[PDB]
Amino acid sequence: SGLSVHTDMASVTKAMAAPESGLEVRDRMWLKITIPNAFLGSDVVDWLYHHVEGFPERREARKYASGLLKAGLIRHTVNKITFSEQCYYVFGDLS
Amino acid sequence: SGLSVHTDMASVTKAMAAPESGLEVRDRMWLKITIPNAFLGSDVVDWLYHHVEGFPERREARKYASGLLKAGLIRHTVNKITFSEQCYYVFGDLS
Amino acid sequence: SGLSVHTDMASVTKAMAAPESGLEVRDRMWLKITIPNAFLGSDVVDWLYHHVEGFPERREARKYASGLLKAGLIRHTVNKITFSEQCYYVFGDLS
Amino acid sequence: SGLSVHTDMASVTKAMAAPESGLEVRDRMWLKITIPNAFLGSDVVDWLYHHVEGFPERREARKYASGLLKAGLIRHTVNKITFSEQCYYVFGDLS
């Protein structure tokens, strides 16, 4: 019992920050952003496979989604060249 | 049915964009960022409750954590005011 | 001087990471996200002041904007409470 | 003068949201994230060009930085394969 409510706050925080303190530490985090009308890449692939005739298997639906990205019909919410099923997308200008 | 691999891409996309198309759309996104030594507010509360003497129940370790936030000993990864156990934090300057 | 294209990469990097190396390091990052139809709080205030009759000075159009935020007519792109003219917003549901 | 402080708030907001309302609208936004010890790709290239002997011009310094990324000695804060001078980075595990 070396720390208590009477120890100065700064010292308790440097204790918590030390290697092997026991504090569960992360090198990743997730942030929520409010964006109207965003969608997952996997959901797009699902929609195509179920509603567009002529895909022999789900693989070809992924290739078609990647085509939509290339053409600017859908857009990455943060700019990467590669289509990925875990990233989020929005529609392009469809006017 | 109405759409195939022969339909033009722009029209397939405008069908996917229409109301009631069945595409899962949401007003939010989740973004993964690499940030070394970040931690959940709930993991700060748990650490305090188990390593610092004099909290009669867990509620009191949450109030202490808020106090660390106010003092700048820990910092929100996106400037907010209220301490929340579901958000991610980093250490402030301790030197 | 001490480092060249013949030095091992890991050692060059540890030198760059040392205190007083001269590398510009900061406690913040800026991230660019594609989000259709977003807008600055200052541009909402300006719009209101110029298009809506009965604001004796600009301060009163800022208070009206806060009122839109409270009602959910506009939304913060990252859930905060306070209206700020330097942040970005989107439209809520209006139907 | 068709809108005023006496018009219902919802209607003023749908006015502001209409095409050609005059409201300045964005398809991009910038978010600030607090991350200890982050740095710009361009700053890294500068540091190398000025402190590591054997670069005939700044171009070769960019190629070397891209090598550090590939080797995991520096890391992207959001995961892309390409090194870019406008993105932000953090150090890898240098233990």
Numbering used by the authors:
A (entry chain B), B (entry chain A), C (entry chain A), D (entry chain B): 415 to 509
Give sentences copied directly from the paper behind this entry:
Wnt signalosome assembly relies on reversible head-to-tail polymerization by the N-terminal DIX domain of Dishevelled (Schwarz-Romond et al., 2007), which enables this hub to transduce Wnt signals to cytoplasmic effectors. Here, we use structural analysis, as well as biophysical and cell-based assays, to show that the DEP domain of Dishevelled undergoes a conformational switch, from monomeric to swapped dimer, to trigger DIX-dependent polymerization and signaling to β-catenin.
Purifying lipoyl-tagged DEP (Lip-DEP416–511) by size exclusion chromatography (SEC), we observed two main peaks, corresponding to monomers and dimers (discussed later), in addition to a higher mass species. Thus, we crystallized the monomeric and dimeric fractions and determined three structures at 1.84–2.06 Å resolution. Remarkably, each structure exhibits a swapped dimer, regardless of the crystal form: namely, molecule A (turquoise) donates H1 to the H2–H3 core of molecule B (light turquoise) by extending loop 1, and vice versa. This dimer-specific interface is based on six new hydrogen bonds, which may bias the equilibrium toward the domain-swapped configuration. Indeed, dimerization does not involve any loss of intramolecular interactions, since β1 and β2 do not interact detectably in the monomer (Wong et al., 2000). Interestingly, the solvent-exposed “underside” of the connecting β sheet presents a hydrophobic patch, made up of a triad of hydrophobic amino acids (M443, L445, and I447) located at the DEP finger tip of the monomer. The first condition is met by the clathrin-coated pits in which multiple Dishevelled molecules are juxtaposed, potentially reaching a very high local concentration which could be sufficient to induce DEP dimerization. Thus, they mimic the conditions during DEP crystallization, which inexorably induced domain swapping.
